[PDB]
Design a protein around this ligand. Sequence first.
Ligand SMILES: COCC[NH+]1CCN(c2ccc(Oc3cc(C[N@H+]4CC[C@H](CNC(C)=O)CC4)cc(-c4cc(Cl)cc(Cl)c4)n3)cn2)CC1
Ligand SMILES: *[C@@H]1O[C@H](CO)[C@@H](O)[C@H](O)[C@H]1NC(C)=O
Ligand SMILES: [Ca+2]
Ligand SMILES: [Ca+2]
Ligand SMILES: [Ca+2]
Ligand SMILES: [Cl-]
Ligand code: NA
Ligand code: NA
Ligand code: NA
Ligand code: NA
Length: 472
Amino acid sequence: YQEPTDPKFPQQWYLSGVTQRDLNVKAAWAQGYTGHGIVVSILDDGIEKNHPDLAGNYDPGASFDVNDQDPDPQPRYTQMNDNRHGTRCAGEVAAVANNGVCGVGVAYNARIGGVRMLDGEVTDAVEARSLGLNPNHIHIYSASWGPEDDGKTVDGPARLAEEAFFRGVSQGRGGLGSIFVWASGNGGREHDSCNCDGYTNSIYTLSISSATQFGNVPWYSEACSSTLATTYSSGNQNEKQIVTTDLRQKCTESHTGTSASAPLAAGIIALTLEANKNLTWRDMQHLVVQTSKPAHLNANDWATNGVGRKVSHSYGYGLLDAGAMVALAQNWTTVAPQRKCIIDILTEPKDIGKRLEVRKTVTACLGEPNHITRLEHAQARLTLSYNRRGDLAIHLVSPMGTRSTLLAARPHDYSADGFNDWAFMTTHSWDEDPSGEWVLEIENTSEANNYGTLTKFTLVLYGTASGSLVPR
Ligand SMILES: COCC[NH+]1CCN(c2ccc(Oc3cc(C[N@H+]4CC[C@H](CNC(C)=O)CC4)cc(-c4cc(Cl)cc(Cl)c4)n3)cn2)CC1
Ligand SMILES: *[C@@H]1O[C@H](CO)[C@@H](O)[C@H](O)[C@H]1NC(C)=O
Ligand SMILES: [Ca+2]
Ligand SMILES: [Ca+2]
Ligand SMILES: [Ca+2]
Ligand SMILES: [Cl-]
Ligand code: NA
Ligand code: NA
Ligand code: NA
Ligand code: NA
C-alpha cells in the first residue's frame, strides 16, 4: 500500500500519525477500503462543487439547495467567507487523493455532496427535506449543528424532521436505514449538556464528540450520555487542528470544533460500509461500540459498565478506530429486529424539592415479543415542572450499576418551563441486561429553595434478546 502523496497529507496528523494518536485510517486503506461506491452528504451551508480537491468525487445526486429550492448547493460567496463550513466538512470525508492538492479525505474514493440548508431560515420543513434527500442514493448524512449551543436551550426535531428520521432509518438505504452522523455540540464554554439537543440525543443519530491532539477534552466539548464515540479535532494553540478543503479553491489548516469531528466519523463509517454494504443503521452503532478505543483519552469520568466496557460522557466508548471497524464489519452478523419495551414508572406525581429518587424493579417485558435481555439505547422520558431548570441534575442507574448522567446543571438555563416528555437518552448500558432495579435521581444543585413536580417517568428500553458476546 502506498500512502497519499498530497502536499498537506503529512499535516493530517489524525490520519497520518505514526505515534498511535490517530484514527487508524491507514490500516483501513491498506486493507483495501477507501469508500468506493459509498455516497455521503454534508448537511450545512453549501458545498463548493468545483473545488479542485472535491470535483473528482462530487455527486449531484447527493446534493440539493433547500434554502433557494434548486438542485445546486454552491455556497453564497461573501466578504467574510461565511458559507465555507460545508466545503471544509466535505473535504474531511472525501477530498481527492494523490492529485497534488491540499490533503485527502478519510474516504477519498467516496462520492460527496452537500445540502445547502443553513444559509436561510431553518424551519422544520427545511430540516425534513434535507434529512430525507434522495434516501436510496445517499448512504450517510453528516450534520455538525443543531439548536443553539447557548447552554439554555432545550429543543429537537419538530414533527416533519422526526418523521424524516423514522422514514430514513426504516425505509432508507433499501430498508437498511440511513446513517445519520451528528456532532454532539460546541457549547462547552456555556456549560451546555448535550442531551438537551434532540438531534444528538436521538437514537437515530450516531453521535460524535471531540478529543484534542494531546488527548484532552476540548474547551468546546459538551458531555452527555447520548454520545457514542469520539474523533480528534482542535484544542489549544499548541495543538494542531483539522486540515481540509476551504472555500474559494483553497486549503485550510484551522478547521475546528466538534463540528469538524462528525465529518471524520462519517468518513470512517463510509469505509466501514464499503467493507460490508449490508450493515443496518443499528449494526453500524454496534460496530462503533465494540471497536472504539478509550486508551490515552483523558477524562475524570471513565467508568466500566456492566459488560466491561469503559464509557465517558465526554467521549462515549472512545476514539473511532477505522482499521478495527472495517475488520469487524466484514463478517458481522446482522442484529435481530429492534424491540421496544415501554414501562410507565410512577404510580403518582412526585414532589422534587431538593432531591428526588425513584426506584423501580422491572422485568423488561418478560414473556412478550418486546422482551429485551440485550439493551441498545435506553431513555428516561420525563415530564416535570421546576422553577429554574438549569439547577437540576438528573442521573439514571441501570440494574448493572452503570450511572448515566441524563442532565448536568446548566447555570445559564433560567427557564421555568421544565421538561415536556423529554426523552433523555443513554448509550452507556449498551449490551447490558435491563431487567432489575433502575434508579432515577433528580437533584437541586443550587442552595436556592427551588420547587417542582415529576408527573411522568417512562422508561423506554430498546434492544434484542439474542446474540450477546462474553463481557469485555
Ligand atoms: C463556521 O461556522 C459557520 C457558521 N454557521 C452558520 C449557520 N449555522 C447554523 C445555522 C442555523 C442552525 O439552526 C438549526 C436549528 C435547529 C433546531 N430546529 C428545531 C425545530 C425548529 C422548528 N420548530 C417547530 C415547532 O416547527 C427549527 C430549528 C436545527 C438545525 C439543524 C438541523 C438539521 Cl436536520 C441539520 C443541521 Cl446541520 C442543523 N439547525 C444551526 N447552525 C452553523 C454555523
Ligand atoms: C443482508 O442481511 C439480511 C438479514 O440478515 C439477509 O437476509 C440478506 O441475505 C443479506 N444480504 C446480502 C446481500 O448479504
Ligand atoms: Ca442554489
Ligand atoms: Ca488532495
Ligand atoms: Ca448543545
Ligand atoms: Cl420508537
Ligand atoms: Na450544536
Ligand atoms: Na445520537
Ligand atoms: Na460498573
Ligand atoms: Na437484572
